Design an enzyme around this catalytic site. Structure first.
Site, PDB file in Angstrom:
ATOM      1  N   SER D  32       0.830  -1.199   0.000  1.00  0.00           N
ATOM      2  CA  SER D  32       0.000   0.000   0.000  1.00  0.00           C
ATOM      3  C   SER D  32       0.868   1.254   0.000  1.00  0.00           C
ATOM      4  O   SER D  32       1.807   1.374   0.792  1.00  0.00           O
ATOM      5  CB  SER D  32      -0.910   0.007   1.232  1.00  0.00           C
ATOM      6  N   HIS D  63      -9.479   1.781  -8.411  1.00  0.00           N
ATOM      7  CA  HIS D  63      -8.078   1.476  -8.685  1.00  0.00           C
ATOM      8  C   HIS D  63      -7.882   0.068  -9.223  1.00  0.00           C
ATOM      9  O   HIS D  63      -7.376  -0.812  -8.526  1.00  0.00           O
ATOM     10  CB  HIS D  63      -7.206   1.669  -7.435  1.00  0.00           C
ATOM     11  N   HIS D  85      -6.392  -9.151  -1.182  1.00  0.00           N
ATOM     12  CA  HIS D  85      -6.337  -9.499   0.236  1.00  0.00           C
ATOM     13  C   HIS D  85      -7.463 -10.439   0.631  1.00  0.00           C
ATOM     14  O   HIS D  85      -8.549 -10.402   0.048  1.00  0.00           O
ATOM     15  CB  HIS D  85      -6.473  -8.248   1.105  1.00  0.00           C
ATOM     16  N   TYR D  87      -9.168 -10.233   3.272  1.00  0.00           N
ATOM     17  CA  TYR D  87     -10.278  -9.440   3.805  1.00  0.00           C
ATOM     18  C   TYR D  87     -11.220  -8.908   2.729  1.00  0.00           C
ATOM     19  O   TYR D  87     -12.335  -8.492   3.040  1.00  0.00           O
ATOM     20  CB  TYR D  87      -9.769  -8.281   4.696  1.00  0.00           C
ATOM     21  N   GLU D  88     -10.774  -8.925   1.472  1.00  0.00           N
ATOM     22  CA  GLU D  88     -11.591  -8.447   0.355  1.00  0.00           C
ATOM     23  C   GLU D  88     -12.502  -9.549  -0.166  1.00  0.00           C
ATOM     24  O   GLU D  88     -13.388  -9.302  -0.983  1.00  0.00           O
ATOM     25  CB  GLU D  88     -10.702  -7.935  -0.787  1.00  0.00           C
ATOM     26  N   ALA D 115       2.806  -2.216   3.959  1.00  0.00           N
ATOM     27  CA  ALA D 115       2.727  -1.212   5.006  1.00  0.00           C
ATOM     28  C   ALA D 115       2.268  -2.052   6.185  1.00  0.00           C
ATOM     29  O   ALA D 115       1.447  -2.947   6.016  1.00  0.00           O
ATOM     30  CB  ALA D 115       1.682  -0.156   4.662  1.00  0.00           C
ATOM     31  N   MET D 218      -2.102  -7.603   6.882  1.00  0.00           N
ATOM     32  CA  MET D 218      -3.146  -8.503   6.401  1.00  0.00           C
ATOM     33  C   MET D 218      -2.819  -9.082   5.022  1.00  0.00           C
ATOM     34  O   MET D 218      -3.724  -9.394   4.254  1.00  0.00           O
ATOM     35  CB  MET D 218      -4.483  -7.745   6.322  1.00  0.00           C
ATOM     36  N   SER D 219      -1.536  -9.237   4.718  1.00  0.00           N
ATOM     37  CA  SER D 219      -1.121  -9.757   3.413  1.00  0.00           C
ATOM     38  C   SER D 219       0.249 -10.428   3.467  1.00  0.00           C
ATOM     39  O   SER D 219       0.700 -10.882   4.515  1.00  0.00           O
ATOM     40  CB  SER D 219      -1.020  -8.604   2.422  1.00  0.00           C
ATOM     41  N   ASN D 242       2.480   3.131  11.146  1.00  0.00           N
ATOM     42  CA  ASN D 242       1.810   3.483  12.384  1.00  0.00           C
ATOM     43  C   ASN D 242       2.243   2.551  13.501  1.00  0.00           C
ATOM     44  O   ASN D 242       2.671   1.423  13.251  1.00  0.00           O
ATOM     45  CB  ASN D 242       0.286   3.406  12.193  1.00  0.00           C
ATOM     46  N   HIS D 250      -0.064  14.048  13.899  1.00  0.00           N
ATOM     47  CA  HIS D 250      -0.585  13.297  12.762  1.00  0.00           C
ATOM     48  C   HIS D 250       0.099  13.704  11.458  1.00  0.00           C
ATOM     49  O   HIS D 250       0.581  12.854  10.711  1.00  0.00           O
ATOM     50  CB  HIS D 250      -2.093  13.512  12.630  1.00  0.00           C
TER      51      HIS D 250
END
Ligand SMILES: C[C@@H](Cn1cnc2c(N)nc(N)nc21)OCP(=O)([O-])[O-]
Ligand SMILES: C[C@@H](Cn1cnc2c(N)nc(N)nc21)OCP(=O)([O-])[O-]
Ligand SMILES: C[C@@H](Cn1cnc2c(N)nc(N)nc21)OCP(=O)([O-])[O-]
Ligand SMILES: C[C@@H](Cn1cnc2c(N)nc(N)nc21)OCP(=O)([O-])[O-]
Ligand SMILES: C[C@@H](Cn1cnc2c(N)nc(N)nc21)OCP(=O)([O-])[O-]
Ligand SMILES: C[C@@H](Cn1cnc2c(N)nc(N)nc21)OCP(=O)([O-])[O-]
Ligand SMILES: [Ca+2]
Ligand SMILES: [Ca+2]
Ligand SMILES: [Ca+2]
Ligand SMILES: [Ca+2]
Ligand SMILES: [Ca+2]
Ligand SMILES: [Ca+2]
Ligand SMILES: [Ca+2]
Ligand SMILES: [Ca+2]
Ligand SMILES: [Ca+2]
Ligand SMILES: [Ca+2]
Lengths: 269, 279, 268, 277, 272, 273
Positions: D32, D63, D85, D87-88, D115, D218-219, D242, D250
């Protein structure tokens, strides 16, 4: 069948198309086998590969990925299908007919369908063009129908009539235009019968279909007409007789292209 | 759409070719009651359908089918004892799985047999009908073993079916029947297939006859379509085990008896025909 | 191929048997526009299809079906108000689920009714056609509620269908109609079923008529096939609500009255 | 049970090989915000995932992913810009489909980037973590791209994973990083993969760190497993965007992230010259 | 929610009961490399899994599994030569189908065996580990043979699993191990099951160990869960064929024979 | 599974409910096992069987079909689920959580979740009420998640945070309200861990779970919380400790139920807006 598409799927596809092209066609044309050359008669064309359009079924035959082309034919804004989907390729009817409902949502009012068919009528000769006046939906007899599942009222009624599926007025215009083309052969007319395929008919099957009152046989078109009528589209079409079916145990394509192009001027509105 | 991939057929053929040294050039699908054909077979080696990789398995309890390799009338063949039917729940791509495997084994001719109801008025229980043509009712609605993307290593996208039943074998079947010298003549006609499993109403029977059908059954057609698609020579017969009633006015052990005797006759007929299959 | 197991039918039958003390001997499937037959029942007890275990659920919003137990004209019966159709997306094993349940409840006779398009040009709108025979077009391609391995506890592998519509009830139907002294005659003919939901083209109509069909619809045949397979006596009618295009309500209440009257002619 | 047959991979590979003259030796799966790697590639040729036979199609409306062939820093590469992913909704056999295709194209090395959330207390937003090992949580329950009959033409039935991340490239990474003359050290650690899409609760973050994890995402793991199964050399990095929340109580973070991304992109390019053969 | 219906199990059990006269009281599931236990069995009658109605069929090419009835060490049992794993593509309701069939045959005790990787550093290749407990990782995410509506004819909705591995049999195993003439101690521990098919990374091995796991494999737990749910006595062993890698930093044939002999001896310790 | 329901399905179900009742609930309560009695004590109640509600999953246990009840609890209009759906029963999470999204469309702003759980914390005793302060989603680690599949932006974001799922304010009010009740036992607090089920844990698993930082173990709730937070619902809940988990290898309800029920009724007055 359980139509796998939800109403919003059709809307998403239509919305994607409406935002990727500024053209607004009132007529959609589905090009049959070997009749894809019709797309080359369009001016100011914009093409979209089926594969890139959201929710759009993708072509089966390798090296022949279909395309949706927006353009002008004979002074008329059209959206055309170069390449189609067939039940014999493994596509259920709700997928084969997906594009028809999308067209309705784009604002299309008339659907022109064409196909290559086998001649059952003894008078037909290879190369004849047959105006489709009626059809026989064999798969529909057993329930294979693109309308199977709960009815989507936003498209049409639960029990749509099919007795007036092929526009009576376009029929008259088709005959007039044909004479204007001055062909050596008359414009044929009759009933198209659809069966699953992909194998061609045995002699007993051909005789049977002919006695059913069928004039030409193919493996497409009928599902698209049913969905078109259900969502309120005017419909008319032709079969290019590419072969005479074997009834005993013993160019034309360009002509059709010209014919369809000329008829653009006869489509209402 | 067919669930088997090309290599599935190859894996099964390879398994069979590695488990037997026999190399049949002819395959025979025995219909109901014609299961006795496996007897008469010499040097027989049997494989239960259940043990063959990818092979569909029988439905009728206590009657697990078997694939038998053996010599019939001096000719090496592979026979299906027990078959698969759409009415049992098998899609056609499973019903016809064995036909493509046979092609991969080197088989060049498929002989199909079945028991059928007589529609033609000249037909009697015990008659043997050479299949000259067929009507694929399920095919009319899309139920077809060829549905899905075409596998070119087997055949073409749009295979012709007008010459499905070998003309040369038809002539040899007639000459052989005469050499057999039977009381009844060799019938010939159109076989029509429908799903089943219930038998027909009188209205359906009259309708089928008007369609030009001579015999009615619930099998065979799918196999023939697949056979022709992959290049196999095909010929077959229907054993008329029952006459269909065409009207409402018309109001059994002898019927079964006539069927069993006819069955033995078909077995001898098929055995003799082995010598007539080319190559 | 049928996704229900034998015990599923039993579970549903027991649920109904434990939720009502009524023991129906007759089952009636009400066709389109014939739901009013239920109002003729007395001692009526209703169950929404939605609350009954294993029961398919209606598709048309605002028209949730119901199973009603009660006495029609002296006979204990169970009635289906609202039916299931292949065109709605149900496979035949779901459409006919109720028939097998009725058999397990103890029903011995099934009355099927429907609204149909008239193919026989002798039929007029409003006519009642006693179903004498049928043509199962979906069955030709294998779409059959009996497809799959046979459950012997219900019936045989290859059930005969030539004697589907009880000859005795057909005779009593004719006698009862005359006794009523109706002006219009009681029609009789072959019912052909096709998938739907679209109506026929002129070519299809002419074709169906030449096949020997007198009335066309999109239901009934599946239920009859399953009824005969499990041993139920069968008889029924089509209410001709329209004459199909062949070229380029008091009638419903009368059928409801007639069906009620025939309850007295059902044996046992 | 994998939904693709061996010939599906061959078909896709054949299609690609006949639509581009490029013959990649290394494959890069861009994480990402790391899609900028595609730029700085020369002799580039792009294919939308949608047009490639058998290729899964992006879910994220807007995208549509693409496969990009080209030369990076002296090495022929094929890159994934847009990823798939679990989750998709994609099962792992779809997520990892591209990996087996790459092998059939002639690819010998797979570079995976992503990321990730930082679990190691010493990590700061912007840190780049060389992946030294991983923890496959979905694999503990059987969600595995290798589930189903094994395809011997790709690899063995019980592939080892103890040496998944190439040791030589690990030394090369530290050397190249040192030569770039960076002030912040190159982090190194264990990446743990979980389904997603929701982010972790405090209790979950603590648990994950106690499992020995340094970063969470998550990948990546599904791809690494398929890559090693078919014999690809593997190495990769996690961009710490993060620091996960470890307590119940931020613009600079975004900036550190943006700059770290450019940094990782440059770092991977340089690393191309250290890949063997 | 389990594809099989109660009657499916009954059909299979009936088929077996009518094709053999033997009536086993114990069932043994042979792990990897322990199929040789089927031998040294007297009056054996074998059935290929493929021919048994409803039985799952082996995936490993050239290794079609089979069910064998016979007398081991004075006790009538049925043995599974070859098993089913989730990594092969079978959902757990298929992997465990045989266990419920065994219960319907009259089996009262289930002996489960497997080859496992050693997590406990005290273990050595060739060691035999008595299973004292287990950790069901796939179960933490819902992948469970009991998922779906509960079939009371087999067991209760929420079966306890804390007493899965019979205390008495475990005590009997330690006491009988004496006569094994082994100078190596009879190990004991917790078996942890994960999906597979790939083997663990270093980080996963350290993690599993810290979870309290002594051995790791890709089977057994689903069977034990179903066995306990339908009331079977359970007893089991893991043959430590390898020590997992815990840091980045001919004999087996004899070890298997040892376990086989041990299992045979334990037949005399099974109650009733 | 990527969730079989389409946005319009949730809308259809909400529209149906809104047209069959005039009540506009602001609070939704999912009653755990043994907590069903909460439906009573509800005034002006209107009930709907799960089976008659369009798109609504149906109960699995025979004889105990679930019901959705609308009514007034303690001066607050709400809707309660009497009977629930569990993953161990065969429901994918997109079905288990379907009701939560419907509640959101009905105009609900706060979800109260309750359940029965096993105590892992040595300080808990049977009958204790544990305020859920946080959770551990084991199924979620392997991908079993009600949010799996393309994200529906009309409900929430692609990557919702779960670090603050259990409303801090409600937690402060729960402790304050409990005081007023003047109970003998203290209101416990801790991390709830969700496992698939249906079997109970082995000793090894129980010890493992405690080491993971879990205070109570169950087979539900977490999915509902995840979907609730995704669509912006304020969330708070409790676990009724019905049993103490055994952690020692050598080691050989009702009562709190009603207590939790009156407690929840009391908290209605503390729910904001
Ligand atoms: C294959 C071709 C149709 N098509 C062309 N000829 C025939 C024939 N003899 N029989 C059948 N059943 N179909 C035939 O498709 C053309 P379309 O894609 O334009 O419908
Ligand atoms: C049932 C039998 C065929 N079969 C035999 N007689 C009939 C009949 N009257 N109607 C139908 N539809 N099928 C009939 O199968 C024999 P096979 O397996 O050799 O095809
Ligand atoms: C739609 C209606 C049947 N039905 C009524 N009229 C017709 C007609 N003309 N054509 C067809 N194919 N079906 C017709 O269903 C009534 P039922 O539910 O009582 O069978
Ligand atoms: C969402 C992002 C990964 N990713 C980034 N931060 C986190 C975090 N805190 N927790 C989890 N579970 N995943 C995180 O994906 C990046 P990729 O597509 O490059 O893997
Ligand atoms: C592959 C073998 C199990 N098995 C053997 N060794 C290992 C190991 N190190 N890690 C994992 N996860 N599994 C291991 O299966 C043996 P079974 O069929 O007897 O269970
Ligand atoms: C079964 C009960 C939960 N539940 C209650 N006690 C336990 C326990 N010890 N272990 C597990 N895994 N679950 C437990 O469900 C209650 P709910 O429906 O309110 O969640
Ligand atoms: Ca696409
Ligand atoms: Ca004509
Ligand atoms: Ca088999
Ligand atoms: Ca229901
Ligand atoms: Ca190949
Ligand atoms: Ca595509
Ligand atoms: Ca570290
Ligand atoms: Ca039973
Ligand atoms: Ca088998
Ligand atoms: Ca319902």
């Amino acid at each position: 069948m359980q139509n796998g598409y939800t109403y919003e799927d059709y809307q998403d596809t239509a919305k994607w198309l409406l935002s990727h092209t500024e053209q607004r066609p009132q007529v959609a044309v589905i090009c049959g086998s070997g009749l894809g050359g019709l797309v080359n008669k369009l001016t100011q064309a914009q093409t979209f590969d089926y594969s890139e359009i959201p929710n759009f079924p993708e072509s089966t035959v390798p090296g022949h990925a279909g395309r949706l082309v927006f353009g002008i034919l004979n002074g008329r804004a059209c959206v055309m299908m170069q390449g189609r989907f067939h039940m014999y390729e493994g596509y259920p009817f709700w997928k084969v007919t997906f594009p028809v409902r999308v067209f309705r949502l784009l604002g299309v009012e008339t659907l022109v369908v064409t196909n290559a068919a086998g001649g059952l009528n003894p008078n037909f000769e290879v190369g004849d063009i047959m105006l489709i006046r009626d059809h026989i939906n064999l798969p529909g007899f057993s329930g294979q129908n693109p309308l199977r599942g709960p009815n989507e009222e936003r498209f049409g009624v639960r029990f749509p009539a099919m007795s007036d599926a092929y526009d009576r007025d376009m029929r008259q215009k088709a005959h007039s235009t044909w004479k204007q083309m001055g062909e050596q052969r008359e414009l044929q007319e009759g009933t198209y019968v659809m069966l699953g395929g992909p194998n061609f008919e045995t002699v007993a099957e051909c005789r049977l279909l002919r006695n059913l009152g069928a004039d030409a046989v193919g493996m497409s078109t009928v599902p698209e007409v049913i969905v078109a009528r259900h969502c309120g589209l005017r419909v008319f079409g032709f079969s290019l007789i590419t072969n005479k079916v074997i009834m005993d145990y013993e160019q034309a394509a360009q002509k059709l292209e010209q014919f369809v192009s000329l008829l653009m001027a006869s489509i209402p509105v």
